[PDB]
């Protein structure tokens, strides 16, 4: 869903065709959820699914997410962001340093099946890059 949303945000024809389809067919996105861009089904579905990706990402990865969002604003490609994160594996959030991170990590580790995670830097980079790309494009869509 995030990849489809990224395609929609990147392609200018995509948005216009979606707009035309909705207006012509009189689709009631408000009825579907219970016209304006906030009612676009692509964005609505991506927003509804975003918590799943955020839950995939661990609390210590928030600063890496900010860095990846900055790079995406710099317009580097997905593989370039992947390389950037792979090199800056450090700069991860410090639980001892911050006091919200302590209870955030407690909650993160409480759930079962989340113990065998973050052991693979490639996995960390993949999830960080995906969530950061989705978040950056969502931010651009939300406020131009």
């Amino acid at each position: 869903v995030g990849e489809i949303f990224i395609y929609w945000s990147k392609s200018h024809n995509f948005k216009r065709e979606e707009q035309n389809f909705v207006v012509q067919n009189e689709i009631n996105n408000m009825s579907f959820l219970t016209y304006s861009v906030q009612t676009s089904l692509i964005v609505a579905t991506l927003k509804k699914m975003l918590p799943i990706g955020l839950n995939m990402c661990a609390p210590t990865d928030q600063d890496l997410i900010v860095l990846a969002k900055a790079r995406y604003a710099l317009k580097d490609t997905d593989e370039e962001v992947r390389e950037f994160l792979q090199n800056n594996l450090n700069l991860q959030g410090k639980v001892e340093g911050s006091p919200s991170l302590r209870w955030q990590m407690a909650l993160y580790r409480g759930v079962p099946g989340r113990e065998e995670d973050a052991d693979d830097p490639e996995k960390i980079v993949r999830r960080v890059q995906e969530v950061s790309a989705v978040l950056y494009h969502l931010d651009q869509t939300e406020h131009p």
């Binding site: 408000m30 219970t34 975003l50 918590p51 839950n55 919200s100 209870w103 909650l107």
Partner: protein
């Protein structure tokens, strides 16, 4: 007397059985009651302050001692107001005054002591016995405008047992003749147990529960009030159906008799298994036939009186009816085959079901009224020789089984009518609102302490609705008012889940109603200035589909978690100190980035609640309706404090009872004395009499004014006030036999009605002259007298030494110019300033210093909830031992005492 005082005091709590007895005209309740308390363990000094332990009676409406602060130095229990009357072993307690009382071997309540309390509502009087020996003292002539219940007040370090007779505690001493065991007062739809009184908080499984006001019965709830059915005349067309319905009801009666096993015999007896009346309706004896007939006529007359119209619809319907078949076995020694008329072809509208319920209510209430007139009363245990019945209570209080029995018995008659075809049109029902208290006062508001207000960030908390009634939950500003409905003004954004609504400066539809156990997650995002509500982890949406409940919120001073619970409601507020305790934080809010409100707090968040104890507060300088002017003293007038109604005679004008007092008291001396127009210097310098006056302005009705004094413990915000509502009680101490040694009257309001000084001829028309009422108090003798327009009045009062009295005026405004406190003097009589201020004790010149001002009675005020509460264990010890109450762990608070207000 000037600096605020501090001291460590014990927390005190009260426990009662759910037994309520009262007196009213036509009430079904017995008048004399008896109970006992046995003391098993008392630690005289568990802490530095002596252990508190008192037993007695209290009035349902008015006795509400909250934990912590209160009258005097706190620790309020039985007898610390004028709604309760307690005995502690050595003293009789009432109105926060301890009066020594003599008994053989008198001592403070100790282990193995038995206190017997007897209440006689006819006098009325309350008497005590200690270990069987009479206590030479009684309360009497107290108010009877509520229900009385047994009560024990105590601090930590006690173990006692209520003995209520019967299976709920065996009395160690015989009740005095005519007094009834208190276990007989338990209502039909309740089970005897011990409970706290007016609690706003209780312990729960997951955590403490917040509790709204309890719905309390009134002494008038025991007066049956049926609709008169004698003036109604029975139309002949209904007379035709009267006998037929009687016959059908008799057939139903006979079939029920065969089901029970009743059979026929010349005389009636249950064990003998026989019945004289089992014969056919025509064969039934003429008196019983006419009795069934008049009950039938009463059914139709009640129908008419309730007001629904009866109209003949179809004669073919009448002719189509037939009697059901019954076998030879149902045939019984009489010889007549019971022939109940079939009614399966007819059904009931829900409106007519409500009608049958109302008919059963009226029938039962008429029966109860007749029984009360005969002299019967209610009792959980039936006693025919004593005229005590378990059912002799109003229908509303009757239990479900009896209600269903009567309702079915009458629904059979309605079935007969409808089957015969008579259409019955239930009357239109016009709702009536009792509006006993204002809505903001009624709902209890709990909020976080002001210091926790958040001005930035994203915050989350949870509120579980244990009940499903009226409750609101959301975010409030620090200056939230306690007497306004949550969200009625701009100071709160809340969600009401009884009927999905969002409240801020009014109501709008939002969300959906909640079920019992549903959790509402409240989120505030101060970066986006939005408020969001979730129900069981699902975001609630408006009609337009917006996710946010409120938008464009100004930070201002900040925001605080807040909830409000209506009467009978229970909630559970989870601010998130233990993040794992939150139930839906992970599903919604955690990923969104919201933080639990109390996540990084090492201590639980302190809360405040809207206490409904009226208190006197200075009149605000910007009150919309009331204005007070300080008038300087001229050559011909003394200093004055004048009240005017700003918005009189206009739209949105507020006209309601107003209770005013002056901010400072006069104190009577410790010891009373044994046994033109210039002032005389020696007399004025040696006098102990002080004077003040009240001018009721022309156009203000004197009949709507009361002038006099109040004590520090006046708290009645009575919207329909009169001198009969004033609290009063007489404490009488006597010898071992009669010989009344001392009769002392106690009250908190000493006033004269302004209507006593209006001439009968002057009555009925507005007067054009002011009315001046003067109050004189002799601080050295305790005597209070009044004058009207310079003429001495008959009313007079006597008070005890050290009494504190505030000048007071209760008025219902009827004019823009209402009343004026005049701080003047009289010949050879000192002004109020001389009594109030030490430096002016010898100054005869009237003064009104800035400290002296007018204060009005406000119904609700914010009060801090204690962080810890006394742990009281209540349990039924046994059939003979009674109901045990135990409190062992000490709890203390640091109290701050305002000397002049004695609180």
């Amino acid at each position: 007397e000037l600096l605020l005082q501090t001291n460590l005091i014990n927390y005190v709590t009260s426990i009662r059985p759910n037994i309520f007895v009262g007196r009213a005209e036509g009430s079904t309740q017995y008048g004399k009651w008896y109970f006992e308390v046995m003391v098993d363990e008392v630690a005289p000094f568990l802490t530095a302050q002596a252990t508190h332990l008192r037993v007695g009676w209290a009035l349902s409406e008015g006795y509400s001692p909250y934990p912590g602060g209160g009258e005097g130095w706190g620790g309020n229990g039985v007898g610390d107001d004028l709604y309760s009357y307690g005995f502690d072993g050595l003293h009789l307690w009432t109105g926060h005054v301890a009066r020594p009382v003599t008994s053989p071997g008198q001592h403070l309540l100790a282990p193995e002591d038995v206190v017997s309390c007897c209440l006689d509502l006819s006098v009325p009087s309350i008497s005590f016995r200690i270990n069987g020996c009479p206590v030479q003292g009684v309360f009497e002539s107290f108010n009877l405008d509520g229900l009385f219940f047994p009560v024990v007040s105590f601090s930590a370090g006690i173990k006692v047992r209520f003995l209520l007779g019967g299976r709920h505690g065996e009395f160690k001493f015989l009740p005095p003749p005519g007094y009834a065991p208190c276990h007989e007062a338990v209502l039909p739809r309740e089970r005897l147990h011990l409970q706290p009184i007016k609690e706003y908080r209780r312990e729960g499984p997951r955590g403490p529960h917040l509790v709204g006001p309890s719905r309390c019965l009134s002494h008038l709830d025991f007066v049956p009030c049926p609709v008169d059915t004698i003036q109604i005349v029975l139309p002949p067309h209904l007379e035709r159906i009267r006998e037929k319905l009687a016959e059908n009801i008799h057939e139903l009666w006979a079939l029920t008799r065969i089901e029970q096993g009743w059979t026929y015999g010349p005389v009636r007896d249950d064990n003998k298994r026989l019945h004289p009346c089992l014969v056919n309706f025509h064969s039934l004896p003429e008196p019983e036939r006419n009795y069934n007939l008049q009950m039938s006529g009463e059914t139709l007359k009640t129908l008419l009186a309730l007001g629904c119209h009866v109209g003949m619809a179809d004669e073919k319907a009448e002719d189509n009816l037939k009697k059901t078949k019954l076998p030879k076995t149902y045939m019984m020694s009489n010889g007549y085959k019971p022939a109940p008329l079939d009614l399966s072809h007819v059904r009931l509208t829900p409106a007519q079901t409500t009608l049958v319920d109302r008919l059963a209510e009226n029938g039962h209430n008429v029966w109860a009224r007749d029984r009360v007139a005969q002299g019967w009363s209610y009792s959980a245990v039936q006693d025919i020789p004593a005229r005590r019945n378990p059912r002799l209570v109003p229908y509303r209080l009757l239990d479900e089984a009896t209600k269903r029995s009567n309702r079915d018995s009458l629904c059979q008659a309605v079935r007969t009518l409808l089957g015969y075809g008579y259409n019955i049109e239930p009357p239109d029902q016009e709702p009536s609102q009792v509006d006993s208290q204002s809505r903001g006062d009624r709902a209890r508001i709990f909020r976080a302490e002001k210091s926790y207000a958040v001005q930035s960030g994203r915050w989350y908390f949870e509120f579980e609705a244990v009940t499903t009634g009226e409750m609101r939950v959301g975010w409030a500003r620090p200056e939230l008012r306690p007497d306004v409905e949550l969200g009625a003004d701009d100071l709160a954004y809340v969600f009401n889940g009884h009927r999905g609504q969002r409240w801020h400066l009014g109501s709008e539809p939002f969300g959906r109603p909640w079920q019992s156990g549903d959790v509402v997650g409240c989120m505030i995002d101060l970066t986006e200035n939005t408020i969001i509500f979730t129900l069981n982890g699902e975001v609630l949406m408006s009609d337009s589909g917006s996710e946010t409940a409120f938008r464009d919120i100004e930070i201002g001073d900040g925001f605080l978690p807040v909830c409000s619970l209506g009467p009978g409601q229970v909630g559970h507020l989870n601010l998130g100190q233990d993040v794992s305790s939150l139930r839906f934080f992970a599903i919604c809010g955690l990923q969104e980035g919201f933080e639990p409100f109390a996540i990084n707090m090492q201590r639980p968040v302190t809360t405040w609640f809207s206490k409904s104890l009226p208190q006197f507060e200075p009149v605000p300088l910007e009150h919309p309706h009331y204005e007070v002017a300080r008038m300087d003293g001229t050559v011909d007038t003394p200093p004055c404090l004048r009240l005017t109604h700003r918005t009189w005679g206009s739209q949105n004008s507020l006209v309601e009872m107003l209770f005013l007092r002056l901010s400072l008291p006069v104190q009577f001396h410790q010891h009373f004395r044994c046994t033109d127009n210039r002032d005389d210097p020696e007399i004025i310098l040696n006098t102990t009499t002080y004077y003040y006056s009240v001018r009721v302005f022309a156009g203000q009705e004197p009949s709507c004014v009361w002038v006099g004094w109040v004590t520090p413990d006046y708290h009645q915000h009575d919207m329909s006030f009169d001198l009969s509502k004033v609290r009063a009680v007489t404490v009488t101490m006597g010898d071992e036999q009669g010989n009344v040694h001392s009769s002392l009257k106690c009250s908190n309001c000493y006033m004269v009605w302004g209507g006593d000084f209006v001439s009968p001829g002057q009555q009925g028309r507005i007067s054009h002259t002011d009315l001046v009422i003067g109050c004189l108090v002799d601080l050295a003798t305790g005597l209070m007298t009044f004058t009207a327009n310079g003429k001495e009045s008959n009313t007079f009062f006597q008070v005890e030494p050290n009494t504190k009295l505030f000048p007071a005026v209760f008025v219902l405004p009827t004019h823009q110019n209402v009343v004026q406190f005049e701080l003047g003097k009289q010949k050879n009589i000192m002004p109020l300033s001389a009594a109030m201020f030490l430096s002016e004790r010898k100054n005869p010149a009237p003064q009104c210093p800035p400290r002296l001002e007018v204060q009005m009675l406000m119904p609700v005020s914010w009060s801090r909830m204690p962080n810890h509460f006394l742990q009281v264990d209540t349990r039924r010890a046994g059939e003979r031992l009674g109901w045990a109450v135990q409190c062992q762990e000490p709890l203390m608070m640091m109290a701050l005492h305002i000397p002049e207000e004695n609180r």
